[PDB]
């Protein structure tokens, strides 16, 4: 189905539906993809009041949510259109980012700066929306998940907390967004292994051509980026290509680790920066 007529059967007001009327065109996920759904499934809030309440379980759980687009909130009826891949759709923002037209946009959890009443707590249930953040932000906020998960292994707990307090502040396009203050979890641990697996194999699959470049570049040339990199031979080319091909599979694999599911491709950011023609789920 595409048109998901949702009767949120809960006890809502005009001021509630006065918010969704102004939000027609936003992103509501549904877990089930019926034609007829209710308040308890529609809206992502049903999983953010879980007791573990970390990005470990919720990142892997919104990958089973199915995104829809808010249309025509009549009374409590919804027209949540399951978008078919490759059509153009206007998409209303909920994350405080101007979305920088032309980029990949992805679906992130409601970011761990409190817990927003996404609509209003209708009978102790608010309709909380995932933030529709760009590709750079979700990759950076999931990099720092692993950054504080790596140093959760080799330091004392106060120095783990010294790591988290340093890197929980993320400033990216008018958003000062916050790390979960991570509970170390097995779902990240099987992923943090696969990172450290992949990092070792790059040190194997890089021959003596790649790594000799920059360490000889600092011998002769002086560059602005090289001033940070200082602070941080066989003749057969075909096997150098053939080792570098399998190297690039690793760095796409480890990028896909700190990535999430790609989603909406921004076509036309509005001049008021509140809607965007989006395609390519």
């Amino acid at each position: 189905e595409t048109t998901v007529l949702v009767t949120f059967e809960q006890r809502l007001t005009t001021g509630d539906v006065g918010k969704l009327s102004r939000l027609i065109g936003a992103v509501i996920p549904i877990p089930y993809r019926h034609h007829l759904l209710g308040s308890s499934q529609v809206g992502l809030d049903a999983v953010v009041k879980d007791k573990t309440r970390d990005y470990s379980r919720m990142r892997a759980r919104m990958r089973e949510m199915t995104l829809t687009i808010m249309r025509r909130v009549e009374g409590n009826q919804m027209i949540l259109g399951v978008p078919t891949h490759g059509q153009c759709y206007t998409i209303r923002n909920t994350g405080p980012v101007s979305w920088e037209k032309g980029d990949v946009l992805t679906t992130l959890p409601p970011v761990f700066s409190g817990e927003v009443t996404g609509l209003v707590s209708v009978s102790d249930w608010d309709l909380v929306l995932p933030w529709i953040v760009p590709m750079a932000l979700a990759t950076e906020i999931n990099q720092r998940m692993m950054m504080l998960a790596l140093l959760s292994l080799d330091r004392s707990h106060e120095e783990v907390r010294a790591a988290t307090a340093q890197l929980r502040v993320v400033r990216y396009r008018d958003a000062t967004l916050t790390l979960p203050e991570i509970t170390i979890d097995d779902t990240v641990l099987i992923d943090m292994r696969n990172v450290c697996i992949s990092l070792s194999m790059i040190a194997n699959l890089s021959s003596e051509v790649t790594l000799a470049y920059v360490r000889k570049l600092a011998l002769e040339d002086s560059n602005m980026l090289l001033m940070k990199c200082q602070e941080i031979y066989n003749i057969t080319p075909t096997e150098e290509l053939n080792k570098l091909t399998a190297l690039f599979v690793m760095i796409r694999q480890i990028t896909d680790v700190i990535s999430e599911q790609p989603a909406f491709l921004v076509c036309d950011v509005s001049p008021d920066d509140k809607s965007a023609l989006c395609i390519y789920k």
Binding site: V17, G18, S21, R22, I24, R72, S270, P271, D272
Partner: protein, 94 residues
Amino acid sequence: NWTATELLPKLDVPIDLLTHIKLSVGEEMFNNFRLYYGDDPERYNLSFEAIFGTYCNKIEWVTFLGTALATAAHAIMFHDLNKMTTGKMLFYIQ
């Protein structure tokens, strides 16, 4: 409310502006603005409260004599009763 602004018929009236209405919400010379750039589905959306009829509780009226207890009473009006002390029926018994 603003759906009432967009749906209902308005008076049309000549109005001046200082500079420009898209800038007149900048320093906010107009109190409580609302601005839309495109085809906006808000006025195509409604709601009620749907209050239905406030039914009155017409309560049943009873009097002392209308109830069945009146046979147990010999009910007498006497208007100078507040002056009395102790009604004291004497019974002579042969």
